[PDB]
Amino acid sequence: ACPQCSCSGTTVDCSGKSLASVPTGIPTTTQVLYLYDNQITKLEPGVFDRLTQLTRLDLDNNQLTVLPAGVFDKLTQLTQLSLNDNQLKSIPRGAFDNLKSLTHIWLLNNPWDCACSDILYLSRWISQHPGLVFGYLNLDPDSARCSGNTPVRAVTEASTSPSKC
């Protein structure tokens, strides 16, 4: 079943619907899931676990404050992930480790908290995958910037502390 969303084949378009939450009952056949331009702050843990066919997941332009750990762990076919234009401070340790098909991720325009050692995962990950990180127009791994705005990948690491979290 299609969820306030419009579905056409394996595309589920829930964009621009003032949604405060990800609709339940997204079909497991879904390949393209648009959730951008909404008012989502929190995700249900495990919300995408059955969506093993996903190729694109657009979460940009929401109010996301945190991601659940493991939230992308089953998405082994995901090629494009947009997380820009949210309120994220860090990425859970290991969150992208299973994303073996990833070719484009957008991370910019989030208030990354580089003073907290929780940032080290994301900083190290961007450092190893600069060719995957896009800005609004093209490749731009420096576009993920520390709040207050050195690039997250350039965080030296004596800058951070578990105490400033």
Fold and architecture overview:
This protein is mainly beta and 165 residues long. The chain has one helix and seven strands; from the N terminus they run ββββββαβ. A seven-stranded mixed β-sheet has the order 1-2-3-4-5-6-7, with no helix packed on it. A hairpin with a 2-residue loop joins strand 1 (6-8) and strand 2 (11-13). The longest helix is centred in the C-terminal third of the chain and has 9 residues, at 120-128. The protein is globular.
List keywords for this structure.
monomer, 165 residues, mainly beta, Leucine-rich repeat, LRR (right-handed beta-alpha superhelix), globular, immune system, VLR, antibody, monomeric
According to CATH, the homologous superfamily is: Ribonuclease Inhibitor
Number of distinct beta strands: 7
Largest sheet: 7 strands, mixed
How would you sum up the global shape? globular
CATH class: Alpha Beta
Classify the helix fraction into a percent range: under 10%
Roughly what fraction of the amino acids lie in strands? 5-15%
Reported by name, the CATH topology is Leucine-rich repeat, LRR (right-handed beta-alpha superhelix)
Order of helices and strands: EEEEEEHE
Domain module count: 1
CATH architecture: Alpha-Beta Horseshoe
The structural class is mainly beta
Strand order of the largest sheet: 1-2-3-4-5-6-7
Tally of alpha and pi helices? 1
